[PDB]
Design a protein around this ligand. Structure first.
Ligand code: HEM
Length: 381
């Protein structure tokens, strides 16, 4: 009987206690804090089929939803209508168009970090601000508000008190309300403009719903990307031969981003409840049963990935579930991939001497029940 969720022992490996469940495919079981048993999807093929099944729910308002302690929560057709409105802002072409803006953001934060001193706390100096500044550009927040937006987005993650997190949420919701007005009578480019055009053309996203979309995109897009920058950098520094390959051939960085997404799987333990019976081979997930998708184990299914517990830039990470799959699959994945390519590739290019400025086991990382990644990352160069 294995308790879920558990803390990682090593920032870049799945929790040690899950290792015996990896052989039990496609479905195993884990126990939540209150003794409730839930299904634990260990099979890659099964995880992909299940994450496409409308009989699983993300609606945390259901009495039967598993407590391990808007888009998400929404079942279709509401959910489908929300996604339809946002998908066009998140195409591959729209991500590729953002490259020069992302490069400028990354370059400015590295210039400032290098100027300030010979060492840095990389999470606060780089990993945290890159994605909130990209989301700033994505939403079309005007230049003069960039500092305000970065400051409030940081407060929403770093707090420290629950009061700071709440005041930041209210400040951003209030700001998004004002900006929708500003952009109606002074249209620019970005997701808010895209959704203002949709509202005039279709009446579809009302102002309250547009504000919720902006808040969701920031929350979905900020910490995940920041933790991938921080944990990827720590993982690379702890694998000198793998890091050396990327320094030698910058052309490897896009494939390395996929392999790091697979190997790190920071959005770990996706949760669903079955609304109706769902069969998986000769097993049946009954209506009301919890279903947990341990991203990190699914991405290490050795039926799909040879030597799955090793970092390998040459062994295909294609079809990984780091961005989820099916109904709720990450809307930002095209944008996230380019942010990571530019952030990690530019860091590696500019700072070839980059190294940890503390022993690896004194560097704090997130506990098991949240998005995985580094809290701090002291580096020198
Ligand atoms: C490396 C960075 C990221 C990772 C690892 C990641 C991972 C994920 C995962 C696993 C989900 C599905 C959750 C589930 O099925 O329960 C998801 C959903 C989502 N992501 Fe991402 N994400 C990243 C970056 C972004 C960015 C940059 C944005 C927006 C700018 C974004 C917006 C979203 C949205 C809006 C959803 C919900 C889609 C829906 O519910 O229909 N994410 N993300």
């Amino acid at each position: 009987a294995v308790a879920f969720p558990q803390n990682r022992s090593c920032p870049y490996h799945p929790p040690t206690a899950y290792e015996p469940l990896r052989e039990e495919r496609p479905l195993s079981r884990v126990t939540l804090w209150n003794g409730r048993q839930v299904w634990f999807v260990t099979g890659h093929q099964a995880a992909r089929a299940l994450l496409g099944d409308q009989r699983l729910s993300t609606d945390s308002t259901r009495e039967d939803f598993p407590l391990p302690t808007a888009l998400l929560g929404w079942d279709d057709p509401e959910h489908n209508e929300q996604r339809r409105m946002l998908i066009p802002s998140f195409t591959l072409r729209r991500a590729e168009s953002m490259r020069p803006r992302i490069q400028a953001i990354v370059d400015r934060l590295l210039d400032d970090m290098i100027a300030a001193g010979p060492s840095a706390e990389l999470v606060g100096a780089f990993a945290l601000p890159v994605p909130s500044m990209v989301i700033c550009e994505l939403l079309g927040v005007p230049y003069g508000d960039h500092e305000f937006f970065e400051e409030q987005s940081r407060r929403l993650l770093r707090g420290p008190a629950a009061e700071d997190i709440e005041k930041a949420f209210r400040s951003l919701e209030g700001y998004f309300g004002e900006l929708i007005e500003t952009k109606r009578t002074d249209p620019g480019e970005g997701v808010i403009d895209d959704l203002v055009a949709r509202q005039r053309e279709e009446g579809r996203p009302d102002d309250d719903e547009l504000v919720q979309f902006a808040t969701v995109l920031l929350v979905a897009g900020h910490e995940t990307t920041a933790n991938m920058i921080s944990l990827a950098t720590y993982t690379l520094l702890e694998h000198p031969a793998r890091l050396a390959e990327l320094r030698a051939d910058p052309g490897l960085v896009p494939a390395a981003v996929e392999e790091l997404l697979r190997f790190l799987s920071i959005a770990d333990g996706l949760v669903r409840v079955a609304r109706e019976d769902v069969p998986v081979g000769d097993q049946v997930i009954r209506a009301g049963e919890g279903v947990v998708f341990p991203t990190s184990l699914i991405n290490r299914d050795d039926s799909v990935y040879e030597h799955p517990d090793t970092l390998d830039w040459s062994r295909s990470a294609r079809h990984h579930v780091a961005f989820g799959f099916g109904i709720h699959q990450c809307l930002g994945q095209n944008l996230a991939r380019i942010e990571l390519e530019i952030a990690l590739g530019t860091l590696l290019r500019r700072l070839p001497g980059l190294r940890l400025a503390a022993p690896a086991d004194r560097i704090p990382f997130k506990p098991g029940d949240t998005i995985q990644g580094m809290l701090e990352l002291p580096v020198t160069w």
